Design a protein around this ligand. Structure first.
Ligand SMILES: Nc1ncnc2c1ncn2[C@@H]1O[C@H](COP(=O)(O)OP(=O)(O)OP(O)(O)=S)[C@@H](O)[C@H]1O
Ligand SMILES: Nc1ncnc2c1ncn2[C@@H]1O[C@H](COP(=O)(O)OP(=O)(O)OP(O)(O)=S)[C@@H](O)[C@H]1O
Lengths: 343, 105, 11, 352, 141, 105, 126, 133
């Protein structure tokens, strides 16, 4: 019913910078809602670097959504019969959100995070067997295509009266996340002809070569096959969504634009103590450069702030007669200390 | 309705609270049982009812089905209440039995 | 006990 | 009211020396954690995230000592763990959820108390990946442990049995959130200095223009460890997502001769006091000299093992003395001189 | 105990905590007695790492054992199993502190004398300025 | 532990599954019994534990607690398991008599 | 039946499923055809070992199936059906089938003016 | 069975014990029937002396040919520590080793036949009489 405009607009507050990813997410939800009222389905795959907002998008989508939604992790998943959790447990978590309504669960959406962790790997002669690789991908693949899977009968009480609810996952929508590491190198072989010693041969410097974000945009299913994923697994997902590394401008906006901005978090921490905090635009620019250099996504921003306010926050509560705090670009450079306003 | 399943619940939970390891006795001779004949002896097989011994334990009046490893291979075992004979804790002498049910015949 | 004392196993 | 960081720093300074940077980070984090616990919502319309701490320091630098001492001064639940024991789910090794169970036990199985607590994970460097690229073979105690901890640090519900797994079929596993649980990691990271040296120092080839450090002007591990970035840890071998979960990183400098000398008598549980009590309960008195402590520090520093080296020197010096001391009689006090440490003289004895 | 058979947690080899289980049997499964018990280890030289071997390949027999014994030696709570045969995560295990337990390690380090002689003597050299040392002058093992 | 609380819950649910009226037999001579003495006769009393006539029913192991209406005034009932003599259905008397136990004296 | 699902190594499960479609008819079950999929996935836990177990079904072996009871009653209810008449087929699309064949088919390489050479990518259709 | 697949202990995982397991599967895990079974080996070549397994794989077969007890899973399942392995005596199991040898004929020719090999007057295998091989 709701058009993708309000979906992307409302979602724009929490997440900023990603354009293509938002459109795909809103389109899928819009198509899902229309289909829910009355064919088929299309699963989404999110392939982005660390700190790109993959997990953030799922959390925000839950608030905007009005149907059952749940977030699961693939690390805990293990082959049937082992101490670890099973794929069927994911459906159980979904039921808990919808008051264990089988009808509501069938129309619900399920998002799995950290999917790149599971992948076919070596025999590992020292260990008995690998239960977190191909073993958990075949069962999961069966769930993606749509099949009835036995689940506990809502766990309402000790005896659910022989319900044995089995939910068909055909109608349910599956979205896969994960931050694949080293995939850019695999794509490099296919998209880079190589280098030669001769003059005619093209050699690319560390700066001239394209970044991981560019290579990720050109990703194909063939690359994922040899990466450690089953070919049928990726084939089931017909939509591929890719993110890109953030920029200085994007990082600057994230510091103060969202309602849960990092700057606002520290400001509230200082406000509750009876002290005011101020920020300068020039300071944010320097922070973006340092954070980008760390190559850790938006999380790198926090590392800079804490390092700058370490000594300040250590002595701030001990001292008194402090009204406001002002931070300049020099403070970020480590050549001065924040200015204090007394009285 | 038969008194075998409701009685099984009381004796099962009773033994659990006592810290004893509860065990169940099944009569393979009666129809409906699903157990390996090689392990069953004297027309009866002792199936551990403890939660750790089995998997996805669910007790219903019509039938009870559990997942357990027989010989190191996973298998599915489902036994009707009629085949069940008695429930007792094998660790100690304490034990109880189920009275005969008329409807089962 | 025909069934193993522990159904779940660890590799 | 909530104690200030200066007060907390004073308590840790009593047992730790030469770790001002580490004590500042821990004090500030604990101070912020107390404020978050004081206010349930913690903000009018915002959500304050947690900054997980990392403690990179050489051996015998007081890394574990800080966690143990902090537990005494803390009030909220605290717990220590060993990363080597941890393994990914579905294996014989201990599971990650067991860590929360230990913390859960400390608070008398109170979910609310466990929801807000501090966790210490030692030997984090041991589970480090061998190479930056993904391991071709499954790493049960390496990459697997890191991948499992990613969701825990970020914040997610966990299932824990209240008393015993066999007490009930499902146990109605207690759901505890970890989005507000602070985590402190500690590791030695042996060989990391080489990585920063390769990146910071260049032009080491055979040439006129290329410069040679001469192994005399080379930056020490303590000062070199200060210069560190996430890219350095990647080369050493670690998941980049894991580093993102730890925004604040602290470095511990290597102990010096002056720092070691203070450790001999200044802390509460000092090596000298330990042996003094051992001799006191036997009915003998012991004395030390400033010159003896100076010589011990020099020899200890040469061992390159941290504060632990001190125990090695003293033990070897009192080996013969402690062996024949109980056999003798009428002795009341013992005096240790600098010459005794050198081995050219025996400790003086006092007869009552 | 024998260090050769020891293996880090999460592998088919017996875990380091199994050593505590053996001690418990001697003291009739008494936690207090085990805390004040003594432990001897042999073949400690065998678990020594291989400097030539690159770090790319994980070592569980030699390196994994050393890394696991750090907390146990220094003193840490160990979830010793009741019998030591297997350690399931769901299974319940006894908690025994090792803050006061004493450990003794032994082993005939083969080739250690060669390393010490190279560092202590440093008499190699063919040049006129370099000193010449006779084989008899070399110190005993 | 005593079997009475486990058998009680098992037999209690059974009568409800057959559209019956579960009725309990309580001994008012045991210490700690909190029941209407005016409604007791010959040292015993009959209490209806059906959901239609009882609210907030709790079948615990230590004692049975529930609220009910006696005449025109609501009253709270508390009966230890040791005082529960038997359970029978008002429609046909179906049920069983609880046997003695060592713990109950 | 998927090969990966049965790679661990049951055959009786597939036989009873086939019988259920024909209402446990021995004659109709024999006429039934069985197809195996995902065989390439298991090609290089049993692996080749489970193939020997499946080979028994190819030669023909009797299988006991309950008649919708869903429980084991070997004395009376189990129905015996032979698998000799049943036809077994399978589809394989394993990776690099053309390259493996080209190793034994092409078998040509030379360095000379008259030596036979082919395009770097390919000269023959897949 | 294929000898090339076999590997020494501590390697990827293929072991000589698996050979007996296959035999037991044919006879429905019947130890008595297995003793009378006729074992066969194929492609014995390609494994020999030049670390790599090589000849080490063959060494494991030594005890099998002469006869020895072999541990096998109870019901042809993956090796688990929480289970027992049955013992099968191979002292009565006949072994048939077959393989195609490439180049052995050349070695034999130098030993028994008198030829100058690569020579102007030396005989060459151009007559196409493969029967001589
Ligand atoms: N576009 C964005 N706008 C605002 N904050 C963002 C954005 N992307 C990331 N963040 C911040 O990054 C943190 C969330 O990390 P994520 O980006 O969700 O991690 P990820 O990209 O999913 O990679 P993983 O989960 O480690 S595999 C929060 O502190 C967010 O505020
Ligand atoms: N400043 C200090 N004051 C007193 N004792 C200290 C100090 N620094 C280290 N120690 C001693 O060193 C030991 C603890 O060392 P830590 O640095 O806390 O841990 P650790 O040795 O680094 O662990 P690793 O990383 O596995 S080697 C104890 O015996 C302490 O008494």
């Amino acid at each position: 019913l709701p058009t993708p405009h309000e979906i992307r607009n409302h979602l724009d507050d929490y997440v900023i910078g990603q354009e293509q990813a938002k459109k795909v997410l809103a389109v899928a939800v819009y198509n899902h809602y229309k289909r829910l009222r009355n064919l088929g389905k299309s699963n989404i795959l999110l392939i982005g670097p660390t700190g790109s907002g993959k997990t953030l998008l799922a959390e925000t989508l839950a608030r905007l959504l009005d149907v059952p939604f749940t977030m699961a992790d693939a690390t805990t998943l293990t082959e049937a019969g082992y101490v670890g959790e099973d794929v069927e447990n994911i459906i159980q978590k979904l039921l808990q959100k919808c008051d264990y309504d089988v009808q509501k669960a069938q129309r619900g959406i399920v998002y799995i995070d950290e999917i790149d962790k599971i992948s076919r790997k070596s025999d590992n002669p020292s260990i008995t067997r690998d239960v977190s690789g191909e073993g958990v991908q075949q069962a999961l693949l069966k769930l993606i295509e749509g099949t009835v899977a036995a689940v506990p009968p809502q766990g309402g009480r000790k005896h659910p009266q022989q319900e044995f609810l089995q939910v068909d996952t055909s109608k349910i929508l599956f979205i896969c996340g994960g931050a694949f590491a080293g995939l850019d190198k695999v794509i490099s072989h296919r998209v880079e002809t190589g280098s030669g010693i001769g003059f005619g041969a093209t050699v690319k410097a560390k700066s001239d070569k394209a970044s991981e974000g560019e290579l990720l945009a050109q990703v194909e299913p063939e690359d994922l096959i040899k990466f450690g994923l089953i070919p049928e697994f990726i084939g089931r997902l017909p939509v591929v969504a890719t993110l890109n590394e953030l920029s200085e401008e994007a990082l600057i906006q994230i510091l103060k634009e969202p309602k849960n901005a990092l700057t606002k978090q520290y400001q509230a921490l200082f406000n509750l103590e009876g002290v005011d905090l101020e920020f300068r635009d020039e300071a944010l620019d320097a922070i973006a450069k340092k954070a980008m250099a760390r190559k850790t996504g938006a999380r790198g921003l926090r590392s800079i702030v804490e390092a700058a306010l370490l000594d300040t926050m250590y002595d701030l509560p001990s001292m008194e007669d402090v009204e406001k705090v002002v931070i300049d670009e020099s403070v970020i450079d480590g050549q001065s200390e924040p200015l204090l306003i007394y009285g | 309705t038969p008194r075998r399943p409701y009685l099984l619940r009381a004796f099962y939970e009773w033994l659990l609270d006592n810290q004893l390891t509860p065990h169940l006795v099944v009569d393979v001779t009666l129809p409906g049982v699903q157990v390996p004949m090689e392990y069953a002896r004297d027309g009866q097989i002792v199936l551990n009812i403890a939660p750790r011994a089995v998997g996805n334990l669910e007790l219903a009046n019509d039938e009870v089905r559990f997942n357990a490893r027989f010989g190191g291979i996973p298998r599915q075992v489902s036994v009707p209440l009629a085949a069940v004979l008695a429930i007792y804790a094998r660790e100690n002498g304490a034990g109880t039995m189920f009275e005969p049910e008329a409807a089962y015949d | 006990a025909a069934n193993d004392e522990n159904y779940a196993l660890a590799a």
